[PDB]
């Protein structure tokens, strides 16, 4: 079965592939060979009106209050908690990945410091401590995100 920890381990590859494919699409618009890599890619491509709205919110707040390498954990905890205060669905889980991507990107591009390894640990620790990983585990794991 999908354990809570198996979801946590799989989250590293899912988030890495998600960040890779989101950055690639963002660079093409500017001008996998793994099961978790396919999940990451399928979640990176989805462009409904809620995720596009989520991204607009993530960008605006980051442009207003630029995150630093020293506040990023508290910055992450606030928005990630805000995303699962009403409940837990796949749309909010994807927005979590989306915010993790915009957070790592802003610290890299504005703070001149690579932070993907730290934001990845932020996402994994948050999903572990705030029941998001077990919510995914009950649905058979990250593989359930493939066929929405």
């Amino acid at each position, epitope marked *: 079965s999908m354990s809570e920890e198996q979801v946590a381990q799989d989250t590293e590859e899912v988030f890495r592939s998600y960040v890779f494919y989101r950055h690639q699409q963002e*660079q093409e618009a500017e001008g996998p060979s793994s099961t978790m890599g396919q999940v990451g890619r399928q979640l990176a491509i989805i462009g409904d009106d809620i995720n596009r709205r989520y991204d607009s919110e993530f960008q605006t707040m980051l442009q207003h209050l630029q995150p630093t390498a020293e506040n990023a954990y508290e910055y992450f905890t606030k928005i990630a908690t805000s995303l699962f205060e009403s409940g837990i669905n796949w749309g909010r889980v994807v927005a979590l990945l989306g915010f993790g991507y915009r957070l790592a*990107l802003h610290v890299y591009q504005h703070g001149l410091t*690579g932070f993907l*390894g730290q934001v990845t*640990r932020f996402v994994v620790d948050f999903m572990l401590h705030h029941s998001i990983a077990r919510w995914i585990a009950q649905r058979g794991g990250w593989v359930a995100a493939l066929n929405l």
Partner: antibody
């Protein structure tokens, strides 16, 4: 593929300034950082600073603030490092690098030798 | 400044043995540590990033471990192409490199 090609060797007299170039190809120059590293003969590695070519934002090793000036030309996809008031302590090999989103220096240039002598 | 200390500048190994290069940081750097190989005349090459993640094209015999302050680069089944310089690095906002460890053959 991803390539970083630096300028040719520099041989100059003390008190002069040199500007090393770092040409990028095979990726989006404006979307990745450019790191600069100094390696003295027989010695180890020393970080100088980083620049974001898209924004022109710079951070420096505090030792090199006022000594090294990092710039970038988006048109040419070339980063530049200007060293002023050259002394014997500046004689070294200078590498440019581009890090991944993690921060590790994935791609390195070949290296530019700067020799300061009278 | 964060100081990456490679306590041994020279390490003696043998072909087919395993050797570990230690690197202690002066602060907690989490897992934001990288390992680089350098051979004479050549630019450094990334081997391990994220303390333990092998970079693309790097042989399986290179492994990294550690978190916080102590980090170790372990080379299993040492080959002759592995005799080189090995630098640890923390890539926080102000990046610093370790002093390096030169690998030699025991005799």
């Amino acid at each position: 593929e991803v390539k970083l090609v630096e300028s040719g060797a520099e041989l100059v007299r003390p008190g002069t300034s040199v500007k090393v170039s770092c040409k990028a190809s095979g990726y989006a120059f404006t979307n990745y950082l450019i790191e600069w590293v100094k390696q003295r003969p027989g010695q180890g590695l020393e970080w100088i600073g980083v620049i974001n070519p898209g924004s022109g934002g710079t951070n420096y090793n505090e030792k090199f603030k006022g000594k090294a000036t990092l710039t970038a030309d988006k048109s040419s996809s070339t980063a530049y490092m200007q060293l002023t008031s050259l002394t014997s302590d500046d004689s070294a090999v200078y590498f440019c690098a581009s890090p991944s989103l993690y921060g590790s220096f994935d791609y390195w240039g070949q290296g530019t030798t700067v020799t300061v002598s009278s | 400044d964060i100081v990456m200390t490679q306590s041994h500048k020279f390490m003696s190994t043998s072909v087919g043995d395993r050797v570990s290069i230690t690197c202690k940081a002066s602060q907690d750097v989490g897992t934001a540590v990288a390992w680089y190989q350098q051979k004479p005349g050549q630019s450094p090459k990334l081997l391990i990033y994220w303390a333990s993640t092998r970079h693309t094209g790097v042989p399986d015999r290179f492994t990294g471990s550690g978190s916080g302050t102590d980090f170790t680069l372990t080379i299993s089944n040492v080959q002759s192409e592995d005799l080189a310089d090995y630098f640890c690095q923390q890539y926080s906002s102000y990046r610093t490199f370790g002093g390096g460890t030169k690998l030699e053959i025991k005799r």
